[model samples]
Target: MNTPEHMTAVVQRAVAALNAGDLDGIVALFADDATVEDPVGSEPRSGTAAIREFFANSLKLPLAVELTQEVRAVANEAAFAFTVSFEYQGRKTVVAPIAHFRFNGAGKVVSMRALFGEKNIHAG
Candidate 1:
């Protein structure tokens, strides 16, 4: 099991990478065969190639991503509340999501899942 500090650091680094629009930096945090399920119920993206593509599409738009609260990290696992905001069609949209990450023995992320619903989205 990974230490809480290690898992929490990964979460913070991931958020920083996202805010910087550093696609490569973001993907580098995951394991070779890691899986991602943004929004929880969506089809899971398995492996580095698929996970890479997933974040690539997300970064197509400049995003303002920030953690809204302290991360809850335990042995090898962590959950954090965060927000992703972006401007599209002259409207600013924001989404609040709680993302969970499971770290592998190597300290790389093995699984990521985001929990949110339509009601969590706001536009202005």
Candidate 2:
């Protein structure tokens, strides 16, 4: 596969893993020193172990993201805008956001930055 196709597959698999609550599968797509900058303003989590821990905690929530559009690949980057719905504190809420992913030559994600929220809601 070409770089764009590879990146597209990687993004699709990652999204599937997220919806499936497959924490290990999700982390497997990251490079060893990968970073996830969710929300982007707070401290970015680095390394596979830290990323794993982040997902482990996240998978505890009843979360599901529906892709509203195809992932757009540009050079070494791919991005998708999505709407997520899940139960939190016995109530369901929806979050619509765009996630930009940067992939290495091997199709592993080096960085993922999620641009989300006018109003942020934490499940905790």
Candidate 3:
């Protein structure tokens, strides 16, 4: 059973790993056959190879992540609001996205979907 506390702890660790640019650390939280869909509308990355490649490209930029609200979890699912800010090409951008996670019986995240759109992104 995936308890609320356990799910939330994984969320915390994921954010920490992202901020630290620990690609492998973040990938380790997912199940071997996990899927990830960032921004909800994009094509989902399935399995370890695709998922690892996705995070690898993202880690090329220095990122700052902050939990904007408390994580909420029920059953084997969890959701959380957070902000990811990064700088590139002399501009800084911040995106506030709400991400959902579904954990497997073994406590590894089996599915992740990040919900965000153009309105959630701010550039300066």
Report the poorest 10 consecutive residues by lDDT, candidate 3. Answer: 1-10
Q: Candidate 3: deviation at residue 73, Å? A: 0.9
Per residue, candidate 2 scores C-alpha lDDT tens digits across 9-80 of 888888898899888889999999789988777688999888998888777886797678988988889999
Candidate 1 colliding pairs: none
Candidate lDDT values, in order: 0.94, 0.83, 0.95
- Residue 79, candidate 1: C-alpha displacement in angstroms: 0.2
| Of candidates 2 and 1, the better by lDDT | 1
lDDT of 3 by residue, 1-124 (tens): 7799999999999999999999999999999999999979999999999999999988899999989999999989999999999999999999999999999999999999999999999998
Backbone clashes for every candidate come to 0, 0, 0
Off by over 4 Å in 3: none
lDDT, candidate 1, equals 0.94
lDDT of 1 by residue, 1-124 (tens): 7899888899999999999999998999999988999989989999999999999999999999999999999978999999999999999999998999998899999999999999999998
Regions more than 4 Å wrong, model 1: none
Best-first order by TM-score: 3, 1, 2
What's the best-to-worst order under lDDT?
3, 1, 2
Worst 10 residues of 2 by lDDT: 115-124
What TM-score does each of the candidates earn?
0.97, 0.89, 0.98
